[PDB]
């Protein structure tokens, strides 16, 4: 009939409606790109070792769907991008152990299929028949929703070479199929799509298509021969048990994260508690002049978590943009509905990037991550895990911890701006650090823009350069007159530049932070 | 029918056949066919079966409202299912309605005239906020809207129905 | 017939009356959440050693049955409540004795139910045996009335977790039995309900219900199976002696009152007698700025009270926004109809 509503799309011009679905959540969002995060975890789905890239809109699908508080502990890491997904991008580094398998196709001369399974890292080889092989990457085990390929003949092209169109479908559990995406592939070596695209079955794959590669004998290609089958599923995809995880694992996804070629100026520990990933993060955080968020095991009690952070070695005169945190406060899950307990770097980088989108021409870098009005925890029903315990507030700050408060409206906030710096100096708050790593990024951009040119315009440029950011700094609020008149002058920044010789020209700047205004202390007195 | 014609603007079609004040049966003289056997509630309504009760002025009525889903879901209601299909309808002549067309014109159109939808159909009481705030926000009804390829724009909404008052358990109790 | 009338719900669409009840009261209020008032104290039922939330319509239910007055001294404090319920909430702390246990039901892996109970605070392991236990936390003995566990197959799921409906029942002592609510459980470790919610026992039972807990043991449960069982009761709960109480269990229940996130204004003594317990009450509310309304013992004559006040160590320039109250006065219990004498906290803090 004409009046009919079919249920999912084929080739024809129509509209169709799904049938109603229950067991699903949907989320949208502009993403703002003003200061993007990354950091290593374990998750379902996505490539392993290589950077993926995570919006608002499809954190859900190429992370996967979250994980289960029941099983073990590898629940962390989505919850702590999800508190962080609100605010900008991601650049999320997955790693696995080394018993995860993906499964992979296999196909004959005569076109019988053979399943298979393979681990990761290990290259696909082909032996002496067995043409070709197909095999998904995304690293979905493909066993709750189950992938099927479906291939049929199609038309052959003008040079004669055979064409036959491949579909891959989903099934979920229920039974309903849902077709993912289809192609025209042959296993020619130069048979072209009509539209002048490529068909070749390797290079039609990586090209065009977003969930499945393969491999092709250059031997055995020539006479090789393919049939019509249907149905075809992946069996033998798992990811073996993503709780206990070696720490070569973690340096490794590190070293990767390290070598990204992405703009990110904030790394967020998602999660990892190991001492040697936290250590080799802050390596990283203070080689590209960024500031990190980790923290520590929320589990620990007060009297342990002091020492803690001195296991970590992030204390010290070198690391001093990272900043731990603590949080021993059990809370709802928005998906589980259970009592779940995970950390505090998402919501503190979120406080981050809501001060640093008020000002716009450099951003506002000299507001500090507390307050009522920018840090709010606010997950459901708050419920701290040990009552009896009581902290301490003056060893807590000795050791450099920050702490959490209450607000106004109830809701549990970040009262503390404590960087990882043992010395007693200015820069052992956060805003200071994030400010002069801000000026540094500047001016790096500036010199990179004003290299390799001859003599006689780079005083000048450099001059007018510098002192064009720094005046756009202060009139932003960050930098301040020196509250000490007399020996510093009433001046804001203070420039100087030199040339050495034939090269390696240096230029030096000063300047001065602005107050936080941290402890307020009130005395009421009667006059009777 | 009789539930349908009390709004007007779309139809209201969250009511479900039952109660006395639309479903009443009132042919004549009704009496049973065989008064000794009785029937089974708990296993008449496990085979999804509807039943019939008796009004206040004697007249017997139509007191089901259980369609033949097996599962216990929510859509296993009667109004559910076809507040669901109602919505999938007019979606469906608004699609028809923007149907080959240039673009630059078809996002804004259709994301306009699936909010305007919803929020009539808001207006009229079949959607209410959650039940579950804090995972579910508290938005009635979400929408988005993206395109695939040179075809095939695709439109996902969600909302979320009423309740029905089926069972009542009353419980007096002597204040002596 | 379609004109019968049943007695309790069942899954059909219908409305049913109960059996005409004598010995049950009602009562009705709007809470006004103006100040909110906390305190200490010693009941039946409700979770021992944390902070709960008392309005003015489910104090009869999470704080139990009122106690009586024979039995010993420990029904002040549900007076007290009473007393200062019909002006706002509240944020009581229940303690209880060591020797206070709740019943434990442990089921085999063949599905042979074996009775138990256990003291507070310990956690509750398994042997060897014995797949997974179920254990309730209302605190309630399970005396006075009586819990009983129904457990029944149920329809597999798409995956084929084998799922079963596990009913929790309320026998009272005439004989009338009341279904409190029903839920789908399964012990996979993914089995998802057709809603989308989880279907794990603990994760269930941790998530939607408000009476029952569960510890699964994570070896034997891939191979564990399940039966069909009819009353299954709760069997050796028992709160020991409410009377007789150390003065440890009120300091660390009097510190788990101070580290509560929740705003109050105003701590109540709640029929606290000990002087250690009054001296940290003191402390909290000179902390938080609010003021206690704490009393003395009222069966102190005349002579003796003004001692008692400085042996407290209220007293003094530090506890400044503290008060005493003595009642040397005997009225007519609004429950038992019997000559009882209470403290006069909840009266002041109702004049506030």
Redesign the interface.
Request: glycine residues 6%.
């Given at each position: 009939s004409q009046y009919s509503?079919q249920q999912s799309?084929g080739n024809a011009?129509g509209?169709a409606?799904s049938p109603?679905n229950?067991?699903?959540?949907?989320?949208?969002g502009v993403a703002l790109n003003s200061s993007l995060w990354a950091g290593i975890g374990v998750f379902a789905r996505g490539k392993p070792f290589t950077v993926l890239a995570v919006t608002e809109s499809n954190y859900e699908d190429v992370l996967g769907e979250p994980l289960?508080?029941?099983?073990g502990s590898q629940f962390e890491p989505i919850r702590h991008v999800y508190e962080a997904i609100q605010q900008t991008s991601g650049y999320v580094v997955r790693a696995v152990p080394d018993d995860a398998k993906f499964p992979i196709i296999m196909f004959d001369e005569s076109g019988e299929p053979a399943y298979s399974a393979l681990p990761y890292g290990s290259e696909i080889e082909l032996d002496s028949g067995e043409a070709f092989a197909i095999y998904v990457d995304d690293g979905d085990p493909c066993i709750?929703p189950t992938r099927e390929l479906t291939i049929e003949t199609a038309t052959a092209d003008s040079a004669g070479n055979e064409r036959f169109l491949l579909k891959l479908t989903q099934t979920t559990?229920?039974?309903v199929v849902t077709t993912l995406e289809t192609h025209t592939v042959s296993l020619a070596e130069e048979a072209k799509d009509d539209m002048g695209r490529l068909c070749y079955l390797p290079t039609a794959l990586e090209a065009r298509s977003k969930y499945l590669r393969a491999v092709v004998n250059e031997e055995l290609i020539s006479t090789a021969k393919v049939t019509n089958k249907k149905s075809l599923a992946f069996t033998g995809g798992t990811n073996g048990d993503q709780s206990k995880i070696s720490t070569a694992a973690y340096l490794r996804a590190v070293k990767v994260l390290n070598n990204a070629p992405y703009m990110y100026t904030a790394v967020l520990g998602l999660g990892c508690y190991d001492n040697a990933a936290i250590t080799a993060l802050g390596k990283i955080c203070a080689d590209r002049l960024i500031d990190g968020f980790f923290d520590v095991k929320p589990t620990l009690t007060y009297a342990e978590a002091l020492p803690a952070v001195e296991d970590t070695g992030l204390l010290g005169t070198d690391y001093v943009s990272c900043s731990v945190y603590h949080y021993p406060f059990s809370c709802?899950d928005?998906?589980?509905?259970?009592?779940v307990v995970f950390g505090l770097s998402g919501v503190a980088y979120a406080a981050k990037a809501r001060g640093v989108k008020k000002n716009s021409d450099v951003g506002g870098w000299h507001y500090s991550p507390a307050g009522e009005e920018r840090a709010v925890i606010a997950r459901?029903s708050?419920?701290?895990l040990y009552?009896?315990d009581?902290p301490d507030e003056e060893a807590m700050v000795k050791g450099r911890l920050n702490k959490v408060s209450?607000g106004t409206s109830?809701q549990?906030i970040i009262d503390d701006a404590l960087t990882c710096c043992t010395q007693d100096n200015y820069l052992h708050f956060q805003h200071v650090p994030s400010l002069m790593n801000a000026i540094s990024r500047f001016f790096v951009q500036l010199a990179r823009q004003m290299k390799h040119s001859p003599d006689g315009i780079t005083a000048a440029g450099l001059t007018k350069g510098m002192t064009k950011l720094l005046d756009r700094f202060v009139a932003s609020g960050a930098l301040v007159a020196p509250r000490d008149p007399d020996a510093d002058g009433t001046e804001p920044y203070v420039l100087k530049v030199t040339q050495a010789e034939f090269d390696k020209w240096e230029v030096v700047w000063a300047c001065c932070p602005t107050g936080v205004a941290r402890r307020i202390q009130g005395v009421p007195l009667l006059i009777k």
């Open positions: 509503i799309l011009s509209v409606v109603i229950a067991d699903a959540t949907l989320s949208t289960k508080p029941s099983s709750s559990s229920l039974g709802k928005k998906w589980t509905q259970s009592r459901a708050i419920q701290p009552p009896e009581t209450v109830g549990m």
